[PDB]
Each structure stands twice: as C-alpha cells, then as structure tokens.
Design a protein around this motif. Structure first.
Motif, PDB file in Angstrom:
ATOM      1  N   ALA B 108     -17.972 -44.926  26.760  1.00  0.00           N
ATOM      2  CA  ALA B 108     -19.211 -45.456  26.209  1.00  0.00           C
ATOM      3  C   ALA B 108     -20.253 -44.347  26.155  1.00  0.00           C
ATOM      4  N   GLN B 109     -20.190 -43.445  27.130  1.00  0.00           N
ATOM      5  CA  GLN B 109     -21.097 -42.305  27.185  1.00  0.00           C
ATOM      6  C   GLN B 109     -20.409 -41.042  26.679  1.00  0.00           C
ATOM      7  N   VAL B 110     -20.689 -40.684  25.429  1.00  0.00           N
ATOM      8  CA  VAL B 110     -20.091 -39.505  24.816  1.00  0.00           C
ATOM      9  C   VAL B 110     -21.160 -38.477  24.464  1.00  0.00           C
ATOM     10  N   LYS B 111     -20.859 -37.205  24.706  1.00  0.00           N
ATOM     11  CA  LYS B 111     -21.795 -36.130  24.402  1.00  0.00           C
ATOM     12  C   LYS B 111     -22.042 -36.026  22.902  1.00  0.00           C
ATOM     13  N   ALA B 112     -23.304 -35.846  22.529  1.00  0.00           N
ATOM     14  CA  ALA B 112     -23.672 -35.719  21.125  1.00  0.00           C
ATOM     15  C   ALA B 112     -23.064 -34.459  20.518  1.00  0.00           C
ATOM     16  N   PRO B 113     -22.891 -34.451  19.187  1.00  0.00           N
ATOM     17  CA  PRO B 113     -22.370 -33.277  18.481  1.00  0.00           C
ATOM     18  C   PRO B 113     -23.275 -32.067  18.685  1.00  0.00           C
ATOM     19  N   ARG B 118     -22.668 -29.119  12.672  1.00  0.00           N
ATOM     20  CA  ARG B 118     -23.397 -30.073  11.844  1.00  0.00           C
ATOM     21  C   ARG B 118     -23.700 -29.512  10.458  1.00  0.00           C
ATOM     22  N   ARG B 119     -23.863 -30.408   9.491  1.00  0.00           N
ATOM     23  CA  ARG B 119     -24.074 -30.010   8.106  1.00  0.00           C
ATOM     24  C   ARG B 119     -25.369 -30.601   7.566  1.00  0.00           C
ATOM     25  N   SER B 120     -26.061 -29.838   6.726  1.00  0.00           N
ATOM     26  CA  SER B 120     -27.317 -30.289   6.143  1.00  0.00           C
ATOM     27  C   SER B 120     -27.112 -31.584   5.363  1.00  0.00           C
ATOM     28  N   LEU B 291     -21.233 -34.127  10.462  1.00  0.00           N
ATOM     29  CA  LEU B 291     -20.508 -32.959  10.950  1.00  0.00           C
ATOM     30  C   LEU B 291     -20.323 -31.907   9.859  1.00  0.00           C
ATOM     31  N   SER B 292     -20.161 -30.655  10.276  1.00  0.00           N
ATOM     32  CA  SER B 292     -19.964 -29.558   9.338  1.00  0.00           C
ATOM     33  C   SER B 292     -18.617 -29.688   8.645  1.00  0.00           C
ATOM     34  N   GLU B 293     -18.454 -28.975   7.536  1.00  0.00           N
ATOM     35  CA  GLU B 293     -17.197 -28.987   6.804  1.00  0.00           C
ATOM     36  C   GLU B 293     -16.072 -28.476   7.696  1.00  0.00           C
ATOM     37  N   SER B 297     -16.526 -33.203   8.102  1.00  0.00           N
ATOM     38  CA  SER B 297     -17.587 -33.561   7.165  1.00  0.00           C
ATOM     39  C   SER B 297     -17.916 -35.048   7.231  1.00  0.00           C
ATOM     40  N   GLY B 298     -17.300 -35.746   8.180  1.00  0.00           N
ATOM     41  CA  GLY B 298     -17.587 -37.152   8.393  1.00  0.00           C
ATOM     42  C   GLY B 298     -19.017 -37.335   8.860  1.00  0.00           C
ATOM     43  N   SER B 299     -19.583 -38.512   8.613  1.00  0.00           N
ATOM     44  CA  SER B 299     -20.973 -38.764   8.973  1.00  0.00           C
ATOM     45  C   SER B 299     -21.161 -40.094   9.696  1.00  0.00           C
ATOM     46  N   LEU B 300     -22.060 -40.098  10.675  1.00  0.00           N
ATOM     47  CA  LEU B 300     -22.433 -41.322  11.370  1.00  0.00           C
ATOM     48  C   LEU B 300     -23.925 -41.575  11.201  1.00  0.00           C
ATOM     49  N   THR B 301     -24.269 -42.447  10.259  1.00  0.00           N
ATOM     50  CA  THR B 301     -25.664 -42.785  10.003  1.00  0.00           C
ATOM     51  C   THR B 301     -26.100 -43.938  10.902  1.00  0.00           C
TER      52      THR B 301
END
Lengths: 53, 484, 466, 358
Positions: B108-113, B118-120, B291-293, B297-301
């Motif tokens: 449940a507690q996971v370190k952030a990226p 990370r990608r713009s 995430l970066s390429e 490149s997946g994204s979590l909004t």
C-alpha cells in the motif's frame, strides 16, 4: 449644465469614496488576520491542554 | 511453544485500538490476526507493548487474547483482474462476482517515481467537459484538484470524465486507452452503489475499478483506501498503460488518519491533525506521474477531491493538497444555482501544465477564450447602464460564451464536437443570436455537421490540428448555418 | 444461567470502572447491571483497561453509587424489546415501558448494536416522496426510502417542523412509523404524545400505528449517546423481519454526536477540533449506515439536525450532510421576513432533482426558480446603495420579492403561532403554479401569494384588496 | 478503621485527596475535623477526590475525615419565604432559623414525559415588549441573554415586582412565588436587591438563595440546583414558583474550577466535557406538572452573559438550545433609547400565544 456639474461632482464624490473604501478593505483586512492567527492558536491550545491529562 | 516472537497477548483494548504484549520480531505497518478472526495492522512499536489498529469492531477483541503475525506489510492484489470489480480497501470482493484473479501483489505504501524516470506531460486526458478541456486542460501524469463545496458537482465532474473514456477504451489501441480507478472514501454505501449502477448504464464500468472504504468501515480502512487504490492503478503505469484515479474524497481520509493518530496518543497539530498530515497526502499524490520513455511511458493521472466548508480554501487540509496538485478546478455554489454547470470559477481554477497537454486543434480555437472571460467577469458589473464601443462588444461575447459552456451531465462531447462550438464563439459567429436558443443551437449545429460536413469532423478527430485550409473551411461551414 | 460477579473499582462522574476475575471479562458493548435500592443501574462496557478491569459508561446518573458494589454481566449489549407489541408504547434507552402501561408482551429482544447492511444487500431506488410544503416538495423533494434531514440552530422551529410531517405523511404512509427523541425538550416531547393520541394515530385499546422511544436531554450522556440506537433497532425489525415500509423520525440527531463528545473526554481521549470527539465520522457512520433501504424492506428517515450557533461549518452538521439524500436547511433569516417555513432555498438540495426523476417539466421550472433568486444575494449590494432604479434584469430582480413570498405555506399544526388556517398543496399543482408566474402573475404586488394554497387560492386572495 | 473515616493524603485549592472512605457514596457529604464541610466526586481506586465547601488552611495532612451518609440536600417549604439562604440552605440574613417542612435533595431528576401539561398559563411581567412580543409561560424556560450592563437582571427583577397583584390576593392558584439565585455576584449587590424588594413589599413572596463570588466554587455549583429544589416544593404542591438563575455563566465558571482542580480532562474553552449536561438537568426540572399531579408549575428564567455580543460562543449556544425561548438584549439599542433593549429579530418565545392573554 445642471446635470453636467453633477456628473463632474459624482466622479469627485466617488473618487474620495474608493480611496475611503481603501482605509477599510485594508484596515479591517489586518484585523481579519489578527483574528485568524488568534483563532488557530486558541483552537490549538484547548487540544494541547486536554492532551496532558 | 509460545515464544512471544510471533505470538502476543492483549494487554488492553478499546477505542478501536489494541495494546499487545510481545510480537517481538514484528515489522512496522505489518498486519496481525486476532483470535476473534478480525485483523489489524501494527503502527506503534513501543518498547514493551505494541499498538495495533483494528480493521473491525473492537468488541470482537478481548483482554488477554492471542495475536499471530501475518508477516505481510499492508498489500493489495493488482493487475487487470480488477477491471470491472468493486473491492474494499484490502482488495477483497464486495460485489459478489466471486474471487479475483490477481496478476501479483503490491504494498500500500510505495515509493514515488524518481526525478529521472519522468517525462514532460504532453498526453491529454480529454474530460469531455467543454469548460474543462477548453479552460483548464488536464494532462496525463498531471494532478488536477477537484476542489469545491458540498453539493456543487465535484463528483459529477469527475464522473463525466470517466464516461468520456468510452471513445478509446472501446478501441484497439492500448496507448490511447485510459483505465480508471474510483476511490470511495467516507461515502455511504448507498451512494457508492448508486455510482456503480450509473457507470453500468453507460458501459463505462467495464474499464473502471471501485475501491470502497465507506463511513461504516473502520478508520484504518479509509486511511489505506487511497494508497491501496494508488497501487491498483500504478500497475497500469508500470506496464506502459494509462490510468486515471479519483480520490473521493481526500478531505475524509485526513479525518480518518486524525482519528487514528489521536487515539494512538500521538502529538496533535493545527486543528487536531497530526504533524505528518501533509506527508500523508504528499506521499499519495506524488505517486501519480508520467514515466519517461525509458521505462514504459505509462501515466498515472490523479484527480483528488476536497470538500471545502463554506468556501474557505485557506484551511489546513485544503491549502495543503492545493500546494501539491499541478492545478485546481473550483466549483462555486453561486454559479451552480445561477445556471452555470459545471460551475467553474476560471478566475481561481487554473492548470499548471495547461497548454502543453491540450489538443492542438482546441488550443488554436480557444487561445483567447481564457482571457475573454477573465475580462468579461470584471466588466460584468457594468450591467448597472450605458455602453461605449470598447466595452460594448465584450459584454456581447461573454454573455453567450458562458451560456455555451453550459453542459448537461452524462453528456461528454468529443474534441471533434468541441472545436466547432468554440470556434463559433471566440471568432464571433454567435454574437448575433438570442440566448434563448443558444442551447438548442449546439444540438442542431452539431447534427448539421455530422450529416453534411462529416469530413470536416473526421480530419479534426484524426489529425487533432487545424490546418490553414481546414480552419478556413471551418469558417464557411459555420457562416453557412448562421443563415439558416 | 451463569452470573458473573464484579467489583466497582472507581467512579468519576458517569464513568464507572468495574473489576472482574481472570478470563471472565465481559466484551466491549456488553451490558452490566447493578442492583440499587431505588431500582437498577445499567452500564455499558467501553474498554478493557488491563489487569482484568473494564471501563464503562453509565446509562443513569451514578449518584449514590458505592465503591465495590456487585455488578452482574448480562452477556450481551443492552437488549431491547422488538416486534408488534412495541407499537403505541413509549420506551427508554434501556428498553422498558415508561408510558406507565404495564410490561411489554414482547416475543423477541434484539441487541441495539448491530452491523449495517453490506454493500451487496443495498437497494438503489429513487422514488419521490410527496410531502405538501411547496418550498420543499418542489425545490428539494423527499425520497421514499431515502435519508432526509433538516438542519438549523435554535429558534428556526425544527420541532414544530417535523410535527407537520407526521400529520401529513405518517397517516398517509401505509406501514409502521418509529419516532426517536434524542436529547431534545421533554415538554415538547410530551406535546407529541398529547397530539398523536387525539390525532387517532395512538390508541390505548385500539390500533397503535407508531412506536415511541424517548431519552430527553435531562438524562446523562451515556443514555443520550445510545438512545438513538434503541429506536433504530426497533424500526430496524420492521424492515427485515416484518417485511414492511418503515418511517423513522430522529429528533434530535445532533444530540447523538453531542453526547459522544461529553463521554469522549471523560473516557480518556485527546479532544478533537472544536472540542469534539476523535471518533465523529465513524460514529455517525456506524449509525446512519443502518438507516438504509435493503432488498427486504425500505426505511424512510426524517432526521432533525441542530446547528451550533447557526454555524454550518461545525463538524456536527458537517458530517451529517454527507449522509443525507435530501436536505431542508432552516435559517433564522427567512422567518424574519414572514415566509413560513423558514426554508433557505439556496442550501436545500436533493439528489432527486433530476430530469429523469421528477419529470423534465418539474426540473425545468425548478431551475428557473433557483436562477431568479441567487442574483439577489449578489446584486443586493446595488439595492442597499441605490435600490431598484439602476436595474436594466429589472423584470427578474422584482420576481425575487414575489416568488420568495409564494413559497410560504400555512399549516394546521402551528395554530398557536399565527392563527392562520393551514393549506396543503400537492405535487403537480405547485409545478404548474410556478411556471405561470415565471411575469404573468406580475400584476399583484406584495400580498396575494403570501400564505396561500396552490394557484386557485392565489385568485381568491387577490380579490380581497389589501 | 477506613470504612467510615479517612486521612488526608494531600490538600489545597479547595481540593482534598483522602485515603480510605471505602464505603463512601458518590456525591456524598463529608465533614472534616477542623469543621469545614466537603463533597466526594472522584471515587478513584486508591484515593478520593473531595471538594471543600470552605477554607483550605483548616485541612492539614493526615487529618481525620468523617462521613455524613447524606447526599447533598436542602430544607424546603413555605418557611423560606421572605428569607435569604446560602447554597446549603442555611439562613444568612441573620433572622433566626428557618422552619423546615422537609428536605428535598439537590440532585432531583426532572419529571418524565407522562406527568406534564402543555404550558398555557401566562406570566405577566408588566413589561410591554416582553408580554406583548415574547410572553412567558408557567413551566416555560425563557432565557435572558446579553452582554454586561444591558439590564439583564433588570428585566428579571421587574417580573418579580409585577407579580404583587396576585400575591396579595385571595386566590392561591393565581399566585406566583419567586426564587432568586445569585451566583458569582458580590454580596454588596445582593444586599441592594433585597433593599429594593422590601421597598415594593415583595420580600414576603420571594426566596433568595445567594452563592456570592466570595463563597467556594462548589457553593456556586449547587446554588442553582439547591435553589431549584426550593422552588420545586411549590411545583410539587399545586403552587406556582418562578425561579431566576443569575448569573448562570458564573455557575459554569465555578464548575470549570472544580473539574480542572480535580484533574478531569478539559473540553472546549477549558470547560469540562459535561458542561451541557450541567444546564440540561438543571433547566428541565422547571416544568408544568399534569392535572393528576396537581398542575403545579415551575418557571425558569436563566440568565447568561455574552462577551462582545457573541451568541455564537460555547456556553451561550448550550443554554440557548435548552430554553424554549430567548430575550436577547443588545447594548446598542440600550443607549439608543429602547429599554429594555430587546432585539425583536433575535428574541422569540416558542410557546407563543399558547400562554398569553386572549
């Protein structure tokens, strides 16, 4: 000339008004904060006081 | 052989917390199982005793009870197996559709990226809401706060977003799909059930996952809910896919963690909330990213929800979340009753990313739309008597622009249906129409395009940009409908 | 029967400590009894302190309690009489006929602490409950099977409000009704009993349609923090085991969390914001969640909520809002105008206000009524500085002083307040009545829409020129 | 023997920790060897929390403490009429002993739901605005809320005076005896009021229980309760009594002192957790009995003091949600000419015309 002297007098009447509204929006503005800081502190004192048991 | 290393006796119990003697070789934030059957996780690892927070009714636990270790940190099964399933804060089924095939588990507690992977933000999350996609565009990996007061439409907005996703989740391309995760924290079961059936009558429930930590369930469950769910969606991000998670609502999670910390005899802070009430929400939200390429490149909004009291947005919790999110979307009661729906205060609601994560076709037609209304609001007061020329027209535009931004619920429009309606507005092809029929104008005009100018829409849908020849043809199609 | 003996360790106000022997400790939520010369003292196990000691919450003022008294565990939570025989009988928190009409021939007795229906046993149903009051029926419709609740501080007339609902809906309702009075005025609680008997709803020898559960403010916190659960379990039985439509009235629900605040500190807890209890959203949760509609039966709840200092930000009204399907906010500002009830049309919102619920027309009309109003609150600043001369918008600014007046509805219950005979309008009538005004009926200024029935009444009130 | 006695472990601030008293009752009366009385409130396992009713210097370490076997009680009857007594019931006006017609406890439970009649009998205050706009009823609870020096006591006082028309008459049922509960006030003031009462020949039908600020905290705590008991005898015996609590804000102040020194956890504004219960059980006792019980009533006119015209305060809100009315006196309207400075907008009488003259 009557309603011209008036419009020329209303601008004057309300230029002094907006300026007078300034010594209020900012005067009571400080008084709001003086109350906000005192609200957060007093609201926090009761918690700390009742936590010592 | 009770060795006190894996076993434990209950020294005391009450207030939903149980102080236990023993459990020597235990980890922090680890789960434990009581003789009664109900479980709990250990937070306080005090020298002699160990503090465990119950996941159920404290009645079940008694003094001098037996406590066994699980050897597991708070974890939840993830994977595609949850798509279309309603689970509690622990990954357990509550819909009755049977067990859930997990594609692995995660804490449940996971370190952030990190800062490097990370990608713009450039990929858009088309909400389908005219006011939103035009004024405050949300990007993939971005974090846009849905902040407002009670019964203003905070949830109504977030929902329509999930609904508009059908346009892609029914498609084949996985890079355009956008799976969703709705975290119901604090809501009453009735409402959560109400939501599901609504998502069902729209076939958008097949690509959504609902995590339910209702007001009935214990505090720790509402505390974990967001984190747990953040993992469910984080799976998609880690595998090159895109996921949108809505926290409804974070205001109530805070209260939950407050309840825990207060009973656990922890130092109170401003308004009773513990010290790390900010680090709670910071841990969570900063997990959402594009995430970066390099990796996928997946994204979590993330679209967090804050329920503000009496409009106040300077309170501890509210301002806390705001200072983390990459933008805010505000909803006023004033506008809500006035007729403006969604009631968005553009003067305060602003996205950080903004332009970069918007459809280029929409960016072209609504570049000045943002400003227009910002100047229309201040000139709106001039209604009370005479208009010159410079402010004579400004009052004409915005008076029908906002009337066009009005959009009924459950009716998301595609970007291909937005640009025509926004082009007519900004350029001024609607300025000479009675407001009474501006609403019906939207419909008849869109039906006119789909029937006669089908091509003009299919090039915007596919290209997403407005060419010189295209944008020009757009004007002709518009002024053609203005006559009839 | 296996009697469990205990020794009172300490007594601080309403918090009693009871000692027991090894491995015979009663679980939390259990009931403990103490025999007193006057009668019986009931306690509720709150927490296991350690060393075979339990902390309890008094259900009756522990004044005169001697140290080391013998306490007898009952085995489970305070069990209250549930069933048909509960009808037409006023019983307290503990569960004993305080209407002085002999014991209750109860068949079963179910605990007051019970787990709310699961997520699967939920029943999503949106049916409109027709009341009668115009300002509510139209703008904010009650939900049959939904959780209604009215907010407001003192002087807004809440106890007088729920009294009109009972006369109109309760008699028309085809099922059981359960009233639970929590921490409210005992005298006004008596006026309800005096009323319903002469109404024909309560018959000492005949049919009793409603059950009564009281625990007024004059009683210690422990009882007031639980008496809400006693009335709940009763109505709860009529939902599942009796398979019928239920109707639950709570007054006042605020006194429930308020009672939790009193004990919270005493029990030894670090106080929360505004001096409330750390467990506020879960206490409200473990209460409201049991008041839902299931597959077995449906429950329509009308809860009265008191707002401390008319401050809507207070955690008490705050947490309650999120549990209600519909609201009817009462404000002190609307009654000073003359319009009754004192319903604020700009904070009372129901989730039944949907085009696919009340009918497109209904919604359409209801939206216009709301539009006309808000502008006043904002445009009012021009009226205080000049009035209605700069209004261009000028036709809509005046409908505010006409529509707002037409929302007022006369009642038969409040005859000793105005002396004006009441009026009861229905659903469809109010709809077609407003659409016409939204300015056809703009000819008659001020009075003509004030304290009148539907639209046919407005015609008879415009004749007598005032 | 510890069964009936106890030695002082520690003493100070009117608080006395006692070892023993193994058979002491809760809220039981206790006597000290030095003469000062006390009261048990905390029956902790090891020791006993006891609030003194007098000085502190009197109590030393290891001092012997007796039991009384009595729960705080006060003498009641008609004999108290025309007299001035403290919180214990003892005569302080130095006019000989009082004629005891029985002793009713200080902690009396309020009449249940059943034995009650809707308030219908008006209480003519003689004050225009009051009777005209917000009439008072027998058994009704109307609160006088407002800041200092707004004439709160004034409105209350004049009410007692007006009742003379019926007190000197023949018909007992039309009579309305009075009970005044001076709490937190100074002795000089209570002496001024009585001087004014006997100047309108009103002392004859009034009973004055005063726990002045000088007196111990507990004495101001029981003051209203013991005073309610005094007026209850009239309610219990088909007579009509009207009791005025002034000042109530000062009662809570006192009770906060007790709790904080006994070391009970504080709530909002330092006030004890059960400060709402403090005035709930007190005011509920004032009511109109049923016809089977004798139709005897008890009218309560609580008085609360606000700071800066802030009704939104903690204590003010509590009492407000209790009383069936509220006469809010503003200071702005006071100096502007309107006296009493009743604010028609904030003041209401829930009973209404029900208990007014046709």
């Amino acid at each position: 000339q009557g309603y011209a002297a008036e419009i020329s007098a209303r601008r004057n009447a309300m230029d002094n008004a907006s300026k007078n509204a300034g010594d209020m929006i900012n005067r009571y503005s400080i008084l709001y904060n003086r109350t906000r800081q005192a609200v957060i502190t007093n609201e926090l004192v009761d918690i700390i006081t009742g936590a010592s048991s | 052989e009770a060795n006190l290393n894996e076993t434990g006796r209950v020294l005391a119990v009450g207030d939903g917390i149980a102080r236990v003697f023993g459990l020597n070789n235990i980890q922090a934030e680890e789960l434990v199982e009581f003789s009664s059957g109900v479980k709990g996780m250990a937070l306080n690892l005090e020298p002699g005793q160990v503090g465990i927070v119950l996941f159920g009714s404290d009645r079940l636990v008694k003094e001098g009870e037996l406590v066994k270790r699980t050897g597991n940190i708070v974890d939840v099964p993830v994977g595609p197996g949850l798509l279309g399933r309603v689970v509690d804060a622990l990954g357990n089924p509550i819909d009755g559709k049977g067990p859930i095939d997990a594609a692995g588990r995660s804490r449940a507690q996971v370190k952030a990226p990190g800062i490097l992977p990370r990608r713009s933000v450039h990929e858009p999350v088309q909400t389908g809401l005219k006011a939103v996609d035009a004024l405050v565009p949300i990007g993939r990996g971005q974090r846009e706060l849905i902040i407002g007061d009670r019964q203003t439409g905070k949830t109504a907005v977030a929902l329509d977003t999930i609904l508009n996703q059908k346009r892609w989740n029914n498609g084949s391309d996985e890079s355009k799909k956008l799976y969703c995760v709705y975290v119901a924290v604090g809501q009453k079961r009735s409402t959560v059930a109400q939501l599901v059936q609504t998502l069902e009558q729209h076939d958008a429930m097949k690509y959504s996952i609902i995590v339910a930590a209702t007001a009935s369930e214990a505090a720790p469950l509402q505390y974990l809910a967001p984190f747990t769910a953040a993992s469910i969606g984080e799976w998609f991000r880690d595998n090159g896919k895109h996921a949108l998670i809505v926290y409804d609502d974070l205001s109530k999670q805070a209260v939950a963690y407050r309840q825990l910390s207060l009973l656990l005899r922890r130092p109170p802070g401003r308004e009773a909330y513990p010290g790390d009430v900010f680090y709670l929400h910071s841990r969570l939200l900063e997990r959402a990213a594009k995430l970066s390429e390099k990796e996928g490149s997946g994204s979590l909004t993330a679209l967090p929800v804050i329920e503000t009291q009496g409009g106040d947005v300077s309170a501890y919790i509210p301002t806390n979340v705001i200072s983390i999110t990459d933008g805010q979307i505000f909803l006023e009661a004033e506008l809500f009753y006035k007729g403006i729906r969604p009631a968005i205060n553009v003067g305060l609601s602003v996205s950080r990313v903004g332009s970069a994560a918007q459809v280029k076709a929409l960016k072209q037609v609504a570049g000045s739309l943002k400003l227009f209304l910002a100047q229309y609001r201040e000139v709106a007061a001039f209604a009370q008597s005479d208009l010159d020329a410079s402010t004579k027209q400004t009052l004409v535009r915005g008076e029908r622009l906002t009337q066009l931004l009005k959009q009924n619920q459950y009716s998301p429009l595609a970007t291909e249906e937005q640009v025509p309606l926004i082009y007519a507005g900004v350029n001024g092809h609607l300025d000479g129409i009675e407001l009474s029929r501006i609403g019906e104008f939207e419909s008849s005009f869109l039906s006119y395009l789909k029937s006669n100018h089908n091509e003009l829409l299919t090039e915007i849908r596919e290209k997403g940009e407005l060419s010189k020849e295209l944008l020009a043809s757009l004007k002709s199609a518009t002024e053609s409908f203005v006559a009839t | 029967s296996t009697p469990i003996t205990g020794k009172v360790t300490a007594v601080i106000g309403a918090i009693v400590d009871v000692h027991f022997e090894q491995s015979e400790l009663p679980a939390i939520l259990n009931a403990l009894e103490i025999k007193t010369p006057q009668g019986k003292l009931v306690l509720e196990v709150a927490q296991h302190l350690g060393e075979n000691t339990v902390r309890t919450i008094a259900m009756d003022g522990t004044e005169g309690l001697v140290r080391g008294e013998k306490v007898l565990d009952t085995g489970g939570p305070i069990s209250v009489p549930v069933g048909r025989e509960t009808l037409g009988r006023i019983i307290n928190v503990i569960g004993e006929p305080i209407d002085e009409r002999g014991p209750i021939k109860s068949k079963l007795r179910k605990p007051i602490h019970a787990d709310p229906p699961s997520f699967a046993e939920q029943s999503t149903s949106a049916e409109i409950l027709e009341t009668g009051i115009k300002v509510v029926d139209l703008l904010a419709p009650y939900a049959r099977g939904g959780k209604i609740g009215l907010f407001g501080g003192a002087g807004v007339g809440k106890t007088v409000f729920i009294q009109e609902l009972i006369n109109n809906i309760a008699k028309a309702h085809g099922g059981f009704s359960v009233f639970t009075g929590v921490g409210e005025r005992t005298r006004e609680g008596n006026d309800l009993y005096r009323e319903m008997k002469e109404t024909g709803v309560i018959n000492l020898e005949g049919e009793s349609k409603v059950a009564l559960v009281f625990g007024q403010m004059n009683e210690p916190p422990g009882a007031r923090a639980r008496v809400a659960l006693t009335g709940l379990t009763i109505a709860e039985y009529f939902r599942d085991e009796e398979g019928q439509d239920v109707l639950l009235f709570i007054d006042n629900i605020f006194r429930f969390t308020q009672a939790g605040s009193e004990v919270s500190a005493l029990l030894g807890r670090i106080p929360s914001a505004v001096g409330y209890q750390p467990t506020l959203a879960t206490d409200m949760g473990l209460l409201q969640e049991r008041i839902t509609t299931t597959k077995k039966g449906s429950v329509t709840s009308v809860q009265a909520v008191y707002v401390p200092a008319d401050d809507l930000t207070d955690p008490a009204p705050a947490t309650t809002f999120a549990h209600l399907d519909a609201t009817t906010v009462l404000s002190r500002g609307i009654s000073e105008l003359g319009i009754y009830p004192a319903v604020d049309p700009l904070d009372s919102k129901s989730r039944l206000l949907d085009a696919a619920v009340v009918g497109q027309e209904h919604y359409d009309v209801a939206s216009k009524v709301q539009e006309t109003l808000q502008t006043y609150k904002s445009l009012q600043d021009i009226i205080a500085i000049l009035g209605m001369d700069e209004l261009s918008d000028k036709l809509t600014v005046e409908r505010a002083r006409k529509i707002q007046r037409f929302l007022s509805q006369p009642f038969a219950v409040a005859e000793v307040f105005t002396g004006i005979p009441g009026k009861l309008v229905r659903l469809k009538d109010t709809v077609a009545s407003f659409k016409a005004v939204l300015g056809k009926y703009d000819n008659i200024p001020e009075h003509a829409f004030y304290m009148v029935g539907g639209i046919e009444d407005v015609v008879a009130k415009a004749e007598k020129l005032a």
